[PDB]
């Protein structure tokens, strides 16, 4: 058995706690233990609650710092039922003026190597 | 890079150090590609703020979306068309070659797709610009007729005819995919190109590159360290060149895929989340609306267009 | 103004370009420390120790390694340059279509209905401030595709027919502004037998009270 070792961490500006993912292995062969499609995750608490993805692990699993590191299946967003009918229409009675930013690269530093 | 070149030989590994950071560079380059692939998927499919659902009763004025909507009886919750698309498209690990799983599972991609369809069907283009606003489907279609310069009474007066042409056209998509082996060639070609590149890379481990043997263990079992270092260096040179060739090709291919993903994301926004005036951007004919369907490592758009028919000659004048 | 002043990661897209280029150069320079199989990574050490025949062997090893390192760098720069060019082409397109005009393309010039955009320059990049109209405070109404009056089917010229529960009006689509249904804001097509969901209501003719 062989594979990569990856360390999951919140910034060192936030915490010194880490979780370790042993890629492609069963948790039995390694030497808060959770088996994922990406491998064996150790040091993170697995919960049934779902959140926006913070640090991606793979196959739907993400981790975040909430204190301890937790692992969870990521949410794709809030569920919303549109009140559809064959004679119902919704019309805005107000509006808001929104301003948003978009940032794009244009150029690089012009390097030259002799 | 280290395992590919040297396996678990410490003799080779120590020699490889003489070449500096080449392997760190190669590992970094491949990691960058892998990250991009999840970004590509996100930019295409995660364009919806909320997970929208259709009503329990599918009454849309004669329009039938059953072939594009999720089929609740199937464990994957894919649509009939998506299921068809998905049906149509070890030793590497042993040499240091692995495959990382996608961040978004196929189930999750299907969930995004069905949310986009529910949004479009129940609220038209409003959910793209802000809060979803419900409107009767026939009225939505009437608005889309106005968008192509056709009066709304044309839609209403021919509602049953239009719904029938639509339902039939969708049915033909179902039938065409079920009888055309080459339909998903664009996606299959990507799979084939990547497989070929990996198979080539692995096969290069069989090359001698001028050494007495392609097998590192044969060299180490036969020769003492001075003579062995000469033979090993030959294998390192060849194997490093092979890996560099692979990575460069993957970076170029990755760029091409990214361009395709950027286009797919643009079509999602302009064809699915709105009605497009751009000619031939959202299918041939005058664009009315589009519906996304997810596919293996890709996306399929079903473009609905208005195509003029049965023209007749008239006399005309610029003014009366 | 306030968001940029309190978000360290706001300009990540531009910082990433700076970081990637710095990393590539640092790697290239660090490769000069590699021996590549030679007795020394330092060319002056080789020349001070060995006569020209033996020295040529050691030098050739350094040339091979250093040439490979430089080729790797240049290839990566060409690939990165192409990516930047694509970004610049997109930025140029946005300048033309978002700043020098009003765009109908969905999500091309920000989220919502595009009104206008303003460019701001940035280090090795451009920032666009997109101004959009976003609908708010929606309310439910009853609707119909057509109104039946005097045996004729009437359709809205510009807006949509809505009811507040007791009275029918016509309104513009993106902003509730109910108006009395008249022959000035509707048009007639055929009779009331064809349209599914047609409702019965009065259609007013402004010259009626006059003549
Ligand atoms: C929507 O269209 C589908 C076909 O694409 C209809 O489903 C078929 O219904 C007939 C009976 O009328 C069955 O014999 C077929 O086996 C069904 N086919 C499939 C694939 O299910 C569906 O009934 C239509 N829905 C409505 C409301 O008309
Ligand atoms: C416009 O074209 C449609 C075809 O899409 C014609 O509708 C068909 O008419 C034939 C008889 O000529 C029927 O047998 C078919 O069942 C109809 N098809 C559908 C989907 O209803 C329609 O008649 C044409 N209209 C005009 C004015 O020519
Ligand atoms: C690091 O933490 C400090 C507070 O202790 C905070 O002010 C600072 O912004 C943080 N830096 C980053 C990059 O988040
Ligand atoms: C290893 O994990 C797999 C699931 O990924 C499981 O089916 C298998 O039984 C596990 N093996 C052992 C010895 O637990
Ligand atoms: C999550 O749910 C499973 C049952 O589906 C249960 O066995 C498990 O203990 C739960 N874990 C937590 C932290 O709730
Ligand atoms: C229009 O008239 C031309 C002759 O000038 C004739 O060849 C053509 O077939 C006619 N087309 C139609 C649609 O009637
Ligand atoms: C519209 O009506 C539905 C019930 O059909 C209700 O759930 C929804 O909140 C209403 N929306 C508004 C904006 O009034
Ligand atoms: C509908 O609008 C009319 C005219 O403004 C008004 O008199 C009537 O009371 C309104 N009906 C309801 C239920 O608000
Ligand atoms: C709308 O649906 C209702 C039943 O829910 C039906 O009575 C009514 O006639 C339908 N209206 C139209 C235009 O189909
Ligand atoms: C509308 O009025 C006509 C008579 O002018 C009548 O025949 C028709 O049934 C009415 N429609 C409804 C829904 O009451």
Tab-separated table of C-alpha atoms in Angstrom, chain C:
chain	number	residue	atom	x	y	z
C	1	UNK	CA	-15.177	51.306	-1.246
C	2	UNK	CA	-15.830	49.654	2.131
C	3	UNK	CA	-15.641	46.043	0.918
C	4	UNK	CA	-12.251	46.435	-0.739
C	5	UNK	CA	-10.935	48.116	2.417
C	6	UNK	CA	-11.827	45.076	4.578
C	7	UNK	CA	-11.230	42.014	2.387
C	8	UNK	CA	-7.601	40.732	2.111
C	9	UNK	CA	-8.476	38.233	-0.643
C	10	UNK	CA	-10.442	40.592	-2.888
C	11	UNK	CA	-7.814	40.805	-5.633
C	12	UNK	CA	-6.817	37.149	-5.587
C	13	UNK	CA	-7.096	36.790	-9.365
C	14	UNK	CA	-4.420	39.409	-9.941
C	15	UNK	CA	-2.259	38.334	-7.024
C	16	UNK	CA	-2.247	34.764	-8.322
C	17	UNK	CA	-0.686	35.929	-11.574
C	18	UNK	CA	2.040	37.750	-9.677
C	19	UNK	CA	2.659	34.728	-7.466
C	20	UNK	CA	2.816	32.237	-10.333
C	21	UNK	CA	5.353	34.300	-12.233
C	22	UNK	CA	7.497	34.860	-9.155
C	23	UNK	CA	7.476	31.158	-8.393
C	24	UNK	CA	8.570	30.248	-11.910
C	25	UNK	CA	11.483	32.682	-11.798
C	26	UNK	CA	12.580	31.591	-8.354
C	27	UNK	CA	12.560	27.999	-9.519
C	28	UNK	CA	14.635	28.885	-12.569
C	29	UNK	CA	17.269	30.653	-10.489
C	30	UNK	CA	17.380	27.862	-7.919
C	31	UNK	CA	18.193	25.371	-10.706
C	32	UNK	CA	21.592	27.058	-11.018
C	33	UNK	CA	22.427	25.377	-7.709
C	34	UNK	CA	21.991	21.896	-9.181
C	35	UNK	CA	24.987	19.742	-10.098
C	36	UNK	CA	23.222	17.689	-12.763
C	37	UNK	CA	25.868	15.013	-12.187
C	38	UNK	CA	28.833	17.403	-12.360
C	39	UNK	CA	31.462	17.712	-9.628
C	40	UNK	CA	30.120	21.181	-8.857
C	41	UNK	CA	27.221	23.461	-9.732
C	42	UNK	CA	29.705	26.316	-9.891
C	43	UNK	CA	31.340	26.781	-13.264
C	44	UNK	CA	34.279	28.660	-11.768
C	45	UNK	CA	35.056	25.734	-9.455
C	46	UNK	CA	35.307	23.423	-12.437
C	47	UNK	CA	37.536	25.750	-14.415
C	48	UNK	CA	39.866	26.403	-11.472
C	49	UNK	CA	40.294	22.667	-10.819
C	50	UNK	CA	40.462	20.880	-14.198
C	51	UNK	CA	42.304	21.221	-17.545
C	52	UNK	CA	40.138	21.627	-20.721
C	53	UNK	CA	39.457	17.908	-21.700
C	54	UNK	CA	38.201	16.818	-18.214
C	55	UNK	CA	36.559	20.210	-17.704
C	56	UNK	CA	34.547	19.916	-20.929
C	57	UNK	CA	32.881	16.782	-19.576
C	58	UNK	CA	31.766	18.504	-16.383
C	59	UNK	CA	30.670	21.634	-18.205
C	60	UNK	CA	28.610	19.679	-20.710
C	61	UNK	CA	26.658	18.186	-17.806
C	62	UNK	CA	25.813	21.654	-16.505
C	63	UNK	CA	24.879	22.888	-19.967
C	64	UNK	CA	22.489	19.995	-20.475
C	65	UNK	CA	20.754	20.563	-17.147
C	66	UNK	CA	20.609	24.340	-17.426
C	67	UNK	CA	19.304	24.259	-20.979
C	68	UNK	CA	16.573	21.845	-19.910
C	69	UNK	CA	15.670	24.148	-17.020
C	70	UNK	CA	15.419	27.158	-19.288
C	71	UNK	CA	13.341	25.292	-21.866
C	72	UNK	CA	10.956	24.221	-19.125
C	73	UNK	CA	10.600	27.821	-17.986
C	74	UNK	CA	9.948	29.202	-21.460
C	75	UNK	CA	7.372	26.559	-22.347
C	76	UNK	CA	5.476	27.292	-19.141
C	77	UNK	CA	5.597	31.024	-19.851
C	78	UNK	CA	4.168	30.519	-23.339
C	79	UNK	CA	1.270	28.498	-21.963
C	80	UNK	CA	0.647	31.013	-19.188
C	81	UNK	CA	0.887	33.858	-21.705
C	82	UNK	CA	-1.843	32.323	-23.806
C	83	UNK	CA	-4.107	32.131	-20.773
C	84	UNK	CA	-3.479	35.790	-19.971
C	85	UNK	CA	-4.150	36.767	-23.574
C	86	UNK	CA	-7.538	35.035	-23.407
C	87	UNK	CA	-8.316	36.992	-20.258
C	88	UNK	CA	-7.233	40.245	-21.918
C	89	UNK	CA	-9.415	39.480	-24.939
C	90	UNK	CA	-12.367	38.995	-22.618
C	91	UNK	CA	-11.569	42.220	-20.766
C	92	UNK	CA	-11.433	44.073	-24.077
C	93	UNK	CA	-14.806	42.626	-25.044
C	94	UNK	CA	-16.323	43.715	-21.736
C	95	UNK	CA	-14.901	47.186	-22.177
C	96	UNK	CA	-16.687	47.455	-25.510
C	97	UNK	CA	-19.959	45.794	-24.566
C	98	UNK	CA	-20.398	46.776	-20.885
C	99	UNK	CA	-18.689	50.173	-20.737
C	100	UNK	CA	-19.182	51.562	-24.245
C	101	UNK	CA	-22.721	50.210	-24.424
C	102	UNK	CA	-25.593	48.446	-22.677
C	103	UNK	CA	-25.556	44.662	-22.928
C	104	UNK	CA	-28.466	42.243	-23.288
C	105	UNK	CA	-26.218	39.221	-22.780
C	106	UNK	CA	-27.202	37.449	-19.595
C	107	UNK	CA	-24.591	37.500	-16.823
C	108	UNK	CA	-22.058	39.067	-19.170
C	109	UNK	CA	-21.985	42.425	-17.332
C	110	UNK	CA	-22.831	41.404	-13.769
C	111	UNK	CA	-25.896	39.726	-12.210
C	112	UNK	CA	-29.268	41.367	-12.928
C	113	UNK	CA	-30.363	43.532	-15.825
C	114	UNK	CA	-27.398	45.522	-17.067
C	115	UNK	CA	-27.659	49.298	-16.997
C	116	UNK	CA	-24.064	50.484	-17.311
C	117	UNK	CA	-20.492	49.786	-16.262
C	118	UNK	CA	-17.449	51.746	-15.135
C	119	UNK	CA	-13.808	50.644	-15.591
C	120	UNK	CA	-11.138	51.113	-12.938
C	121	UNK	CA	-7.511	50.342	-13.613
C	122	UNK	CA	-5.553	47.936	-11.380
C	123	UNK	CA	-1.991	46.521	-11.218
C	124	UNK	CA	-1.585	44.405	-14.366
C	125	UNK	CA	-5.359	44.235	-14.690
C	126	UNK	CA	-8.748	45.904	-14.913
C	127	UNK	CA	-11.700	46.136	-12.554
C	128	UNK	CA	-15.221	46.616	-13.841
C	129	UNK	CA	-17.981	48.062	-11.689
C	130	UNK	CA	-21.230	46.737	-13.092
C	131	UNK	CA	-24.475	48.558	-12.376
C	132	UNK	CA	-27.576	46.405	-12.655
C	133	UNK	CA	-31.305	46.615	-12.037
C	134	UNK	CA	-32.541	43.907	-9.689
C	135	UNK	CA	-36.341	43.420	-9.232
C	136	UNK	CA	-37.590	43.408	-5.643
C	137	UNK	CA	-40.672	42.990	-3.469
C	138	UNK	CA	-42.744	40.803	-5.769
C	139	UNK	CA	-46.391	40.080	-5.133
C	140	UNK	CA	-48.818	37.437	-6.531
C	141	UNK	CA	-51.530	38.334	-9.092
C	142	UNK	CA	-54.113	36.430	-11.144
C	143	UNK	CA	-53.467	36.528	-14.881
C	144	UNK	CA	-54.971	35.692	-18.273
C	145	UNK	CA	-53.571	35.444	-21.844
C	146	UNK	CA	-56.418	37.519	-23.271
C	147	UNK	CA	-59.512	39.545	-22.462
C	148	UNK	CA	-62.844	38.866	-24.189
C	149	UNK	CA	-64.973	41.935	-25.004
C	150	UNK	CA	-67.656	42.641	-27.606
C	151	UNK	CA	-67.044	39.108	-28.868
C	152	UNK	CA	-63.416	39.891	-29.702
C	153	UNK	CA	-60.177	38.638	-28.135
C	154	UNK	CA	-57.839	41.358	-26.860
C	155	UNK	CA	-54.134	41.042	-26.094
C	156	UNK	CA	-51.722	43.491	-24.332
C	157	UNK	CA	-49.617	45.628	-26.646
C	158	UNK	CA	-46.671	45.856	-24.271
C	159	UNK	CA	-47.585	44.482	-20.865
C	160	UNK	CA	-49.476	41.688	-19.119
C	161	UNK	CA	-53.068	41.345	-17.883
C	162	UNK	CA	-53.354	41.077	-14.113
C	163	UNK	CA	-56.070	41.083	-11.486
C	164	UNK	CA	-55.885	42.367	-7.899
C	165	UNK	CA	-58.704	39.901	-7.036
C	166	UNK	CA	-61.647	41.992	-8.205
C	167	UNK	CA	-60.466	44.209	-11.080
C	168	UNK	CA	-58.462	43.603	-14.257
C	169	UNK	CA	-55.549	45.820	-15.332
C	170	UNK	CA	-52.664	45.833	-17.758
C	171	UNK	CA	-49.146	46.415	-16.433
C	172	UNK	CA	-45.580	46.580	-17.707
C	173	UNK	CA	-43.806	43.306	-17.028
C	174	UNK	CA	-40.884	44.212	-14.771
C	175	UNK	CA	-42.565	46.755	-12.514
C	176	UNK	CA	-46.083	46.786	-11.142
C	177	UNK	CA	-47.912	49.765	-12.589
C	178	UNK	CA	-51.575	48.848	-13.194
C	179	UNK	CA	-53.546	50.706	-15.846
C	180	UNK	CA	-57.119	50.516	-17.090
C	181	UNK	CA	-57.533	48.186	-20.046
C	182	UNK	CA	-58.332	50.232	-23.140
C	183	UNK	CA	-58.122	50.122	-26.919
C	184	UNK	CA	-54.901	52.146	-26.594
C	185	UNK	CA	-52.942	49.492	-24.697
C	186	UNK	CA	-54.380	46.345	-26.287
C	187	UNK	CA	-54.863	44.893	-29.758
C	188	UNK	CA	-57.503	42.614	-31.250
C	189	UNK	CA	-57.027	39.244	-32.877
C	190	UNK	CA	-59.944	37.004	-33.830
C	191	UNK	CA	-62.805	35.905	-31.583
C	192	UNK	CA	-62.982	34.412	-28.074
C	193	UNK	CA	-63.318	30.777	-29.153
C	194	UNK	CA	-59.647	30.020	-29.728
C	195	UNK	CA	-57.696	31.265	-26.723
C	196	UNK	CA	-57.510	28.914	-23.755
C	197	UNK	CA	-58.045	30.685	-20.448
C	198	UNK	CA	-59.546	33.852	-21.935
C	199	UNK	CA	-61.541	35.884	-19.403
C	200	UNK	CA	-64.510	38.274	-19.761
C	201	UNK	CA	-63.855	41.953	-18.941
C	202	UNK	CA	-64.650	45.427	-20.227
C	203	UNK	CA	-62.226	47.053	-22.656
C	204	UNK	CA	-62.476	50.835	-22.595
C	205	UNK	CA	-62.544	53.139	-25.618
C	206	UNK	CA	-61.423	56.739	-24.695
C	207	UNK	CA	-63.566	58.391	-27.341
C	208	UNK	CA	-66.684	56.734	-25.973
C	209	UNK	CA	-67.556	59.495	-23.385
C	210	UNK	CA	-66.631	62.146	-25.952
C	211	UNK	CA	-68.771	60.788	-28.843
